[PDB]
Design a protein around this ligand. Structure first.
Ligand SMILES: [Fe+3]
Ligand SMILES: [Fe+3]
Lengths: 392, 515, 167, 131, 392, 74, 130
């Protein structure tokens, strides 16, 4: 027995289900069954991602797009609103406009990352059994990969923490989901980097997976001096949540982050016999292109081409881009000094090989962002600025 | 070059690799099937579903998550496990586990089609079917596995893979959807397993049963069974491609009619009376007369949409159909006599038809009350349900000349003095062994193929032994070691023990001794 | 008659003692061929161990096989039967026999007797299954020719049954 | 309609009348039927397809379709063929819904079932024999 | 309305639910709720994989381990049983003993492969967007990878079709599930190889993903002459399902398959700037180690150490190993001729680099298989035998 | 070396990476909160659940499938 | 025991008797309770844990545990602490069952909830203070 009452379920109890059946009308009281039918669909038909996400934030009419009215019920000391237009320089006719092209609400997000979680462990259990680590270049594995690819997790970790204020300050649901999903993927990259280092330590005796050397390198090694100053500024120096997302994903991570992860560690892993690292970089690069898809729709479709504030936003985006591009160029100028420590491989680590790598990063960046906000950039000038820090 | 490339987001869809599957096979001298077949026609056919390995895993896993979510979370929280009417909870011990061996043998039968197929798409297509029948096996297993955890009688649900060997009904099951598939012509499985097995009988066996399950409070089985049949349309698509190649080749078509009618009678000989008995007698609430279910799904739909349509291409109507229709009406009532009479051999708790049940039987089957009804009511008056009665109807049958014989081919029981369905006893002596056959279609199979049908029956194995000694040897008891798993009633008190069966003194005779 | 228990009875224990006294490949081969000629298939010589012969045959197979691995060289395990014949020649000989059979009744006994004599472990597994498959192919094509041509009355006479009862 | 009903023809009669037609001489061989039978496993996605596709555009194109409620599934019977477009179902559901995701709850299919791109079709046409 | 009857669910209908509640006894009729409690547990506790799999096959007492009795109900023309001991030379006291260490019944098998399915397509959409294929060596991409890694799919396809008879002939549930899951992983490798070629074709104009050249290489190029002949024997030459599984997974694929997949295409991809192929080889190698875990348990744990037929089985396994190892050595001798067509890289493609690769494949094979069945093997002799086909 | 290595099947459990999370933060002058607060005490504490990104997604997705299975199907 | 019942103490009284103690002067401030309350979401895994772990080995070690049926969840209240071992739950279910897989159906936790290796434990102890 029990002290309380064993409640009878109305769905199955014959007496209560009969009462419920008598109370339920034999006809529907309305034919509109589309959840939040009034949401303006971005695509041919309204998607479940929009129905579950859009208009969840209770914005009033004095925040562009809000369907509510009145002031907030409780505000900060001094009078700062719960959400307000003072949180960003950018302006729009409707903050609700943003649409993640991947259409990720929470469930498809964790479903896709659960697949990566479980499959990673099956890969590692088999990779350790394969003993493929025997063919890796030992110098690249111990002196370059462990020390500096481990130091790069702090760049990923710093970008993740930049989103702390963005998740509180941004003014619409779909943007908030974009930022938070982008934040978890960044801390994921930081952990997956440390995950690989722990894994190599299990296969290579003497391989120290401690973060002491990567942390000392991230904080004192001049190779990461430019990158560290940039992330400390994007993370803690500013609070304009649009500036943080733009400077973070569309400038720094799109230029320095892409070069370090893909043009250096991922690429050079495939010239130094490293059969393990491409498994991890395959995830971070997948996160980038997925994050880029959402950031591209926020700043290009919605902001840089807002029907009323398009040029107004591009004015700030240009000022932001010009500043943080100089930071990333200075960060890349420091980073190419790491090529002085790697084994010389023709077409990859020589001056011609790094030049073509910088032309890929800057050329793609001009196409993916600069050309979409009217930001002029001489790619040849930016390549030569970074190659100034390269040792022949 | 190293600077310019198309950065458009692209992948590779399943039908993009599937268009190159046919080129994966290369010609060499030994590239033929390993199993015996009489169909050697060209079968370079395409499969109607662009299924590859990664996509196959994607659809099935998607099905499972919804099914296992419904079971492990939803229905468990509702306590739906113990919401099944006792008659139907007992009937799912037989149906799910007997189907399990039909699904399990389908794994091997599909592998023969896989092996005997010549086109790379059909080999890949049958591999997917092979994988599906494994999924079906584990699904039938999961129903009983779940029933064991949340149903008020786990015995029978928990140990059917050994306690089924005690009874005679399990014998015929090892032929209808088991040995009938894997033991014969390999490519002929496109006729017995697919054209007749999957295209005709899975629809009442797997789908129509879900309505009876829900009617009797069982929402576990529909969750799983309906998800099983979602794979069946891909299975029959593979079989139909081969039947086409067989019908177009005149050298191979001269064997299709014979194999079709043989496969139809083989499967209908057991399916028609056994499931008809399980549906009507193993349920409290009836969806519809079994003969109507048979007419709708077997005779009219499958017979017309498949066999009637193929009629304009040499495929004839099965010459055993008239005899099959007589089985659709009465044979399951004949089986009820045998199944209730020999209830200690099973692994489920049966229930005699109540006064409402009898009215439903006589209304839909005029004359049931005067034959089967008076027998069931007499058994009840003799103490069929009372463990202190010492009464078991099998002894009663022999005392009145109603001997039960086992068909050497189909293993289906037959009581000629009480059977209303299709059947006549034929007893032949051949090389010092006596054989009993029941119909013109099975007898011809035994006369032509004796080495294919040397299946020992329950009387030849248990001869001269007492009933309770067989049950105890076959583990037909509950956790206490003395209470029988099978019962003649579905109540929770006065359960029969080995001693109760022993007091009846039932000893297995030799039914063919009188000849 | 009264049968003993199924899985542990005096008939099976008795036959295991006979098996344990087999000490050579030729002796076990003689023992297994005589056993299959006397207790298996519809043309067996006796049904006295009908509910036990299949388990006994397994135990005979297990003895002959262990005696093969302990005594026979590796090549004899692959290319030769335990009767000493070339396994490939056995396949060609029994194939040409069933293809020369003039009726389904001649063909069925050639296939049945083949499985009685050369079922593994006497003949190698791979050669046996290939030979049994080819024999079953010829036996099916000739049995499934006018499968309903002979009526039941005439089919009973051709089989040679003793009709004890016809309801 | 009518001829495609689950309880059509002999299925209306009961008792002695049902047996008289069941055991009739002309009903001892199969009769060619130009019909198809499609069974849909009940789900949130399938109940939307039933109400807005087969009973709307499917029945407008093929007036002979019949949809019967069978507790756990939908019993659909029609003349000629039955078509379901997964791309159309995806727009209706607002989620990714390929032809393979459609087959998640498409069970029995008495007829020639196949897929053409994003459309599932069970037809009465004998491919490889007709045409 | 409808012609038939709308059946009322016994779970929810008040009238039927009341009847069911009245007929259901208020007590359980047995306390044993463990599904097939009598299964002998291999591990600490009985596993759900075992409950759903074990004793599913209805074997009689004359098949070792069968709990049933009697002859089969219907047999082949001539008298071949549905299942019989004539299907294999090997013997055991219990065919049901086999246990996949991964404990894969159907649902966890497709669940893990669905994760790989969906994540692959997310990887490709991002990899194509990354434009990372630009850094790959063009000669390796067009002349070696496309032509010969494409030809390797036929070796994988043949191994898959070898299981067709195994899936029909084997004598227990867990063995049957092991073989079929191992068979799908093999056709998966063949399809994933063709998937990568189709994917590269979308990124490289002129790159022909047609199978004509790979098929012409697989069937006529002497580099695959030994491999093709070995697979045609494992697939179509024999019907002993134990021999097929052993020769396939434990000899040929464990030596030749491992060398081609891991020591050649995967390894050399990471010396030629190939950032894409290591994503695909990671799946085939994961499939191998998972299949190896199951194959090892069948032949080593159960058969080679069966209490009564252990030495009897090792007698056949040794004869099998001796035959198919010579085939795999002859197949590897043909395959190392492909090194005459690759760009020379020290420690990878030179004679010392191929020597260390063959020492890895044969050395691991001695530890993983040869030492477990008592098969003595000189690795240095096998390395020198294959290196006879290597051109300096 | 290139020939001998430990081929024991190993992975890396979630709590193995979680033990290094505390070292991910580095000290700099601007590493402070952006929002107004009256609580400026030391808060270098450990979280009672060894959750990393991959493991968070794995458990939550497991919850969803059971929930959405119950709703969409059952 | 009785004090950990859901309808314990004032929860037994109804009408005026319930109001008289509810508005009593001594019941206007919180009273320190060394108890914990754990809510388990009903599922196949949790119904197995309830019947064979907390009500078997959990009640033997902690006799004060009370488990009440609340239709959709299980209401567990005990003194001191409540422990559930995921490895023990995995052995009972026969499938991989980590501590995170246990948390799939562990809902409310009135107390200091934490995990120690593979064991979930909700204790009345104020960690960092006691
Ligand atoms: Fe099936
Ligand atoms: Fe099937």
């Amino acid at each position: 027995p029990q002290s309380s009452q064993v409640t009878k379920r109305g769905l199955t109890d014959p007496e209560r289900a009969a009462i419920i059946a008598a109370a339920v009308p034999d006809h529907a009281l309305d034919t509109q069954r589309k959840y939040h039918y009034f949401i303006q669909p971005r695509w041919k038909r309204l998607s479940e991602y929009e129905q579950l996400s859009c208009y969840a934030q209770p914005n009033p009419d004095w925040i562009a797009g809000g369907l509510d009215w009145g002031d907030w019920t409780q505000k900060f000391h001094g009078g700062r609103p719960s959400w307000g237009n003072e949180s960003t320089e950018l302006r729009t006719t409707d903050w609700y406009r943003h649409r993640d092209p991947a259409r990720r609400w929470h469930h498809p997000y964790v479903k896709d990352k659960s697949e990566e979680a479980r499959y990673t462990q099956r890969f590692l259990a088999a990779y350790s059994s394969e003993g493929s680590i025997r063919t890796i270049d030992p110098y690249w594995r111990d002196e370059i990969l462990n020390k500096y690819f481990g130091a790069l997790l702090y760049s990923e970790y710093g970008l993740f923490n930049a989103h702390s204020s963005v998740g509180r300050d941004c003014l619409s649901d779909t943007i908030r989901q974009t930022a938070v999903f982008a934040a978890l993927d960044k801390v994921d990259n930081a952990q997956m980097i440390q995950m690989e280092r722990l894994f190599i330590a299990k296969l290579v005796p003497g391989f120290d997976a401690s973060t002491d050397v990567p942390k000392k390198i991230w904080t004192t090694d001049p190779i990461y001096s430019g990158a560290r100053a940039t992330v400390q500024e994007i993370w803690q120096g500013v609070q304009d949540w649009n500036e943080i997302l733009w400077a973070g994903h569309a400038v720094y991570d799109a230029t320095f982050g892409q070069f370090a992860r893909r043009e250096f560690f991922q690429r050079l892993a495939t010239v130094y016999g490293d059969t393990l690292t491409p498994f991890f970089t395959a995830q971070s690069q997948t996160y980038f292109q997925t994050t880029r898809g959402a950031i591209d729709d926020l700043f290009v479709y919605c902001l840089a081409n807002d029907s009323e504030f398009g040029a107004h936003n591009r004015t700030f985006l240009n000022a932001w881009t010009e500043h943080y591009l100089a930071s990333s160029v200075a960060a890349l100028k420091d980073f190419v000094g790491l090529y002085a420590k790697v084994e010389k491989v023709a077409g990859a680590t020589d001056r011609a090989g790094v030049s073509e790598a910088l032309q890929r990063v800057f050329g793609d960046w001009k196409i993916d962002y600069a050309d979409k906000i009217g930001f002029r950039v001489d790619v040849d000038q930016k390549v030569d600025a970074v190659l100034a820090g390269y040792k022949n | 070059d190293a600077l310019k490339v198309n950065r458009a987001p692209v992948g590779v869809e399943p039908q993009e690799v599937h268009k190159w599957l046919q080129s994966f096979n290369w010609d060499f001298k030994e590239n033929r099937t390993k199993y015996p077949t009489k169909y050697h026609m060209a079968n370079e056919t395409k499969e109607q579903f662009k299924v590859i390995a990664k996509e196959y895993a994607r659809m099935e896993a998607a099905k499972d998550e919804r099914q296992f979510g419904t079971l492990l979370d939803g229905l468990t929280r509702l306590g739906a496990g113990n919401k099944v009417h006792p008659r139907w909870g007992e009937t799912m011990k037989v149906i799910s586990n007997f189907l399990e061996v039909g699904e399990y043998n389908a794994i091997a039968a599909s592998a023969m089609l896989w092996d005997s197929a010549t086109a790379a798409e059909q080999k890949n297509g049958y591999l997917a079917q092979v994988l599906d029948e494994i999924r079906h096996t584990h699904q039938c297993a999961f129903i009983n596995h779940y029933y064991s955890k949340h149903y008020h009688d786990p015995a029978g649900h928990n140990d059917a893979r050994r306690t089924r060997a005690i009874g005679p009904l399990w014998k015929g099951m090892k032929r209808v959807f088991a040995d009938g598939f894997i033991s014969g012509d390999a490519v002929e499985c496109s006729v017995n397993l697919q054209l007749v097995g999957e295209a005709c009988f899975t629809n009442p066996l797997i789908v129509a049963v879900t309505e009876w399950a829900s009617a009797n409070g069982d929402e576990i089985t529909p969750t799983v069974f309906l998800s099983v049949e979602t794979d069946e349309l891909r299975h029959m698509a593979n079989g139909y491609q081969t039947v086409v190649s067989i019908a177009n080749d005149p050298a191979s078509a001269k064997f299709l009619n014979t194999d079709l009618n043989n496969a139809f009678w083989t499967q209908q000989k057991y399916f028609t009376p056994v499931l008809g008995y399980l549906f009507e007698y193993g349920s409290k609430f009836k969806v519809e007369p079994w003969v109507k279910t048979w007419n709708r799904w077997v005779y009219e739909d499958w017979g017309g949409i498949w066999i009637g349509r193929l009629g304009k291409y040499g495929v004839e109507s099965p010459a055993s159909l008239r005899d099959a229709k007589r089985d659709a009406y009465w044979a399951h009532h004949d089986l009820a006599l045998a199944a209730y009479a020999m209830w200690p051999l099973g692994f489920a708790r049966l229930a005699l038809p109540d006064e409402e049940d009898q009215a439903w039987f006589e209304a839909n089957y005029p004359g049931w009350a005067d034959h089967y009804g008076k027998i069931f009511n007499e058994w009840k008056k003799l103490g069929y349900e009372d463990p202190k009665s010492g009464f078991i109807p099998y002894q009663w049958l022999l005392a009145n000349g109603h001997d039960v014989y086992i068909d050497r081919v189909s293993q289906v029981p037959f009581i000629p003095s009480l059977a209303k369905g299709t059947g006549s006893l034929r007893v032949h002596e051949f090389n010092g062994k006596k054989h009993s056959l029941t119909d013109d279609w099975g007898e011809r199979q035994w006369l032509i193929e004796p080495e294919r049908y040397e299946c020992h029956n329950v009387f030849e194995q248990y001869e001269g032994r007492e009933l309770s000694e067989v049950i105890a040897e076959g583990h037909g008891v509950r956790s206490d070691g003395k209470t029988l798993i099978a019962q003649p009633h579905t109540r929770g008190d006065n359960l029969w023990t080995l001693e109760d069966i022993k007091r009846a003194g039932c000893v297995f005779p030799d039914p063919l001794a009188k000849f | 008659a009264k049968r003993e228990p199924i899985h542990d009875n005096s008939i099976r224990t008795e036959w295991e003692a006979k098996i344990a006294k087999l000490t050579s490949v030729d002796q076990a081969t003689k023992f297994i061929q005589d056993f299959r000629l006397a207790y298996t298939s519809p043309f067996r010589k006796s049904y006295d161990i009908d509910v036990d012969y299949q388990y006994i045959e397994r135990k005979i197979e297990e003895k002959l096989s262990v005696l093969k691995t302990e005594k026979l060289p590796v090549a004899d395990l692959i290319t030769k039967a335990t009767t000493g014949e070339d396994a490939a020649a056995v396949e060609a000989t029994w194939i040409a026999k069933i293809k020369a059979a003039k009726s389904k009744y001649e063909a069925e006994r050639i296939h049945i007797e083949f499985r009685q004599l050369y079922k593994p472990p006497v003949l190698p597994v791979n050669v046996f299954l290939r030979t049994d498959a080819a024999l079953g192919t010829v036996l099916m094509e000739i049995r499934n020719t006018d499968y309903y041509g002979t009526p039941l009355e005439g089919l009973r006479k051709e089989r040679g049954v003793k009709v004890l009862h016809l309801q | 309609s009518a001829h495609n009903a689950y309880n059509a023809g002999i299925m209306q009669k009961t008792g002695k009348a049902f047996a008289d037609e069941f055991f009739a001489e002309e009903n001892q061989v199969v009769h060619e039927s130009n019909a198809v039978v499609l069974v849909l496993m009940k789900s949130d996605e399938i109940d939307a397809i039933i109400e807005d596709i087969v009973l709307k555009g499917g029945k407008a194109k093929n007036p002979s379709i019949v949809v019967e409620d069978k507790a756990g599934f939908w019993w659909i019977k029609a003349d000629g063929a039955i078509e379901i477009d997964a791309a159309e179902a995806g727009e209706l559901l607002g989620k990714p819904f390929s032809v393979y995701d459609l087959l998640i709850n498409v069970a029995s299919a008495v007829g020639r079932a196949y897929t053409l791109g994003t459309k599932f079709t069970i037809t009465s046409e004998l491919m490889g024999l007709d045409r």
